[PDB]
Amino acid sequence: CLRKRIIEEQITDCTDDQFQNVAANFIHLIVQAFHSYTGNDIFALNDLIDFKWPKYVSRITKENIFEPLALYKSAIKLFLSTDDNLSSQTYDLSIISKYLLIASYICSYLEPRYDASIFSRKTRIIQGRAAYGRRKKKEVNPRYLQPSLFAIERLLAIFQAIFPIQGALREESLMKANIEVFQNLSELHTLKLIATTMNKNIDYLSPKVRWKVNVPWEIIKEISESVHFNISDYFSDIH
């Protein structure tokens, strides 16, 4: 890939030293650029050299082989970020499964007492009082920890609170949990996104098997960006 670049660019001011010096300079560039990333491991440097080599040969033009600094200033993009991952959208799921993931993320990080202050919105007819909410915001940031464990009725209740409107008085537009909601919930349990206390071959239909999410925040933010759900102001009263 370099020995075709020397003839693609019509380069005749070269010898073997003029190749090995830019080779050793590239290796020192990967070292002083990425040693704080890897560590003292030859294997994590060998593959970085294998990745970033032809994208570095594609930046020599006619006289970058003579200088050491403007070639580094011609390829500063591949010495700041590592670029090792395997790379638009976030998840190829349904709408109700995305909202089920969001609602399971909500109920397994929120304390169960403070939801009638965040979701209860309809006009009363009978004398009742809502939840006051938490007085002091706790700054321990609960979404750093492991999640909590909830019953499936709390997931179905928070699911129809955060769901968008669907559907002139026989509609009753507040969506009830049909077959498709339970089927998508079992699909989420199959895809290891919501999960539970794994007793060996657990029964789903027990009132002693509780559920939890095991997807991190960094994908829930992309999901809530996809369905355009304001979830950043749901954990605003913690940090």
Binding site: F43, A44, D47, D50, F51, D84, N85, L86, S87, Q89, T90, Y91, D92, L93, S94, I95, I96, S97, A151, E153, L156, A157, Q160, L174, K176, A177, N178, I179, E180, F182, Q183, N184, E187, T190, L191, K192, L193, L205, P207, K208, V215, P216, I219
Partner: protein, 584 residues
């Protein structure tokens, strides 16, 4: 008896030898029992012709996606090399369910084996290795036309001298989102040492049903940098690139081309239920269209008139049924309101049967091509315009509504073609007996029902399921009880709904005890002529409570295995917890 105490008792039902009728088809007599038997036989044969013509195309599309996918995967599985030569080829099959057969090519003087691996076939690393080398030695020594080896990578080391051929094993992990990635990267590390043997070629194929940011988050980074050597991605999902929804819905129109029509509400219900499910949509398309066809030929007698030979069997009741179509009412109101010929509307109103009997057979030569023009819009968007991201179902929905121009300007690529891609159709009289439709909520009630809501509705209200009677009360055993007393397990739910989250079973018993009649059941309990035990407990001065606890405990231990009640505090079982709420 004692046959409902053992699991799986098979039972042969004996049968009468013959009844000698035509009751070999389930199609009942329609038109409130006035239809002819030969028309019912022709309706059954016609439905079977339609259903066979549909499913013979559905099966070709479904067995053509495999011939497309085997052609797709086996081109980026081969015909390429990497200069490092110490890497495995990796193919990430995104969105794929583990249902595909993989074919490996000839490539002689080289074996090609496929090692399918499963989250049940992988509890740790050694079972993966033993199953993989077992499948390798089996598919190597049975594709040859004798000693026993150990199932580890030594067989991969001396495969060149055991058989004489070079190895090229292609691994295949079925549910990659369901295996431990901690076991999977250990297996990839254990496979990485096979690179030094100069006759192997490992290829990895990952069948992922989620996104790629959830596989390279759970794996370790050295394995990810090993997998970044020759990786390719491939989106395998029948919602990407709407080609197989534009061949199942296209082929459904080729069966109903002129005979049947689709409603607006039906196609938007199809679009609403196909969008709330992503993994399998080529099956939820067909099992909605077939159940729409099955609820049509079972219900509509006029399906016998969708063939143009049965036009002469217009009896009087067919003329009664077709006359009360509101589109015909709109047509007759038109014949009144624009001009006034008397003795033609006086004929066709209720008196003349011949004019209405011959008038309807003119209304079947008409086509008015919705599905005959929609294929032109499909061919225009695919061939002349080259846009392959359109949905034939949603384009057909907007074409059926009439706001097709908004859907064509949704792309802003065919601004010079909004006249060429335009079509404004009208309605033909007597559509509303010839339309597949859902206005009764039938495809909702029996394919995607609100299950828990139906259970709670039948538990709470219960008058929409149990009748009320006005004659059968004196020959019975409980005639005055069906009108003054709710059924137990349906009366207890009225107290379960308006209870708290923690229900004390004694208070839940007292609230059930004072919603029963007292001076009726103490008279009712002495009715039995045969037995004598039921009357002496009525001679006990505490009969009402001892008959009330039996019904209460029966209803409580009947709710409990239905799922509405959790007995907390084991070794007490006294304070139950309400765990199902209505309306959710």
């Amino acid at each position: 008896f004692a046959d409902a105490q053992r699991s799986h008792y098979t039972v042969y039902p004996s049968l009468p030898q013959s009844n000698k009728n035509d009751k070999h088809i389930p199609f009942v007599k329609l038109l409130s029992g006035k239809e002819s038997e030969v028309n019912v036989e022709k309706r059954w044969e016609l439905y079977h012709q339609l259903h066979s013509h549909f499913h013979d195309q559905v099966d070709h599309i479904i067995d053509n996606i495999e011939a497309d996918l085997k052609a797709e995967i086996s081109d980026l599985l081969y015909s390429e090399t990497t200069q490092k030569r110490r890497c495995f080829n990796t193919i990430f099959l995104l969105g794929s369910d583990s249902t595909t057969k993989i074919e490996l090519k000839d490539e002689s003087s080289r074996y090609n084996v496929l090692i399918e691996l499963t989250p049940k076939e992988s509890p740790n690393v050694r079972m993966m290795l033993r199953r993989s080398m077992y499948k390798l030695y089996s598919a190597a020594d049975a594709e040859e036309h004798n000693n026993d080896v150990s199932y580890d990578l030594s067989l991969v080391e001396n495969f060149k001298r055991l058989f004489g051929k070079d190895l090229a094993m292609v691994f295949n992990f079925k549910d990659v989102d369901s295996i431990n990635f901690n076991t999977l990267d250990n297996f990839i590390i254990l496979l990485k040492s096979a690179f030094k043997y100069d006759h192997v070629k490992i290829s990895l194929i990952f069948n992922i049903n989620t996104n790629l940011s959830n596989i390279e988050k759970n794996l370790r980074q050295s394995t990810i940098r090993l997998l970044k050597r020759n990786y390719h991605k491939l989106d395998v999902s029948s919602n990407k690139g709407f080609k197989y929804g534009n061949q199942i819905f296209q082929s459904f129109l080729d069966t109903v081309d002129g005979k049947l029509n689709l409603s607006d509400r039906f196609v938007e219900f199809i679009l609403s239920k196909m969008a709330n499910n992503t993994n399998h949509n080529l099956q939820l398309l067909t099992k909605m269209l077939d159940y729409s066809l099955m609820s049509y030929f079972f219900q509509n007698a006029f399906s016998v008139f969708i063939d143009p030979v049965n036009v002469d069997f217009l009896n009087d009741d067919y003329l009664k049924i077709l006359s009360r179509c509101p589109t015909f009412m709109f047509f007759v109101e038109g014949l009144i309101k624009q001009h006034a010929p008397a003795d033609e509307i006086l004929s066709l109103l209720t008196n003349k049967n011949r004019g209405l009997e011959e008038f309807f057979v003119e209304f079947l030569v008409r086509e008015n091509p919705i599905n005959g023009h929609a294929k032109f819009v499909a061919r225009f968007l695919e061939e002349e315009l080259n846009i392959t991201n359109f949905n034939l179902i949603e384009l057909y929905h907007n074409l059926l509504i009439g706001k097709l121009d908004s859907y064509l300007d949704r792309w802003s690529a065919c601004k010079e073609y909004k006249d060429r891609l335009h079509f404004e159709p009208i309605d033909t009289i007597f559509q509303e007996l010839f339309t597949l439709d859902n206005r009764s909520g039938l495809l909702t009630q029996s394919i995607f029902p609100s299950y828990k809501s139906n259970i709670e509705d039948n538990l709470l209200s219960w008058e929409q399921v149990l009748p009320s009677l006005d004659k059968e009360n004196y020959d019975t055993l409980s005639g005055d009880l069906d009108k003054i007393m709710a059924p137990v397990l349906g009366q207890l739910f009225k107290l379960y709904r308006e209870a708290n989250m923690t229900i004390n079973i004694y208070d839940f018993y007292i609230a059930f005890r004072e919603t029963l009649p007292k001076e009726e059941i103490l008279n009712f309990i002495r009715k039995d002529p045969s037995n004598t035990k039921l009357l002496e407990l009525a001679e006990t001065p505490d009969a009402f409570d001892k008959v009330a606890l039996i019904l209460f405990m029966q209803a409580i231990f009947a709710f409990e295995n239905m799922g509405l009640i959790k007995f907390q505090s084991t070794k007490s079982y006294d304070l139950v917890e309400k765990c199902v709420w209505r309306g959710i």
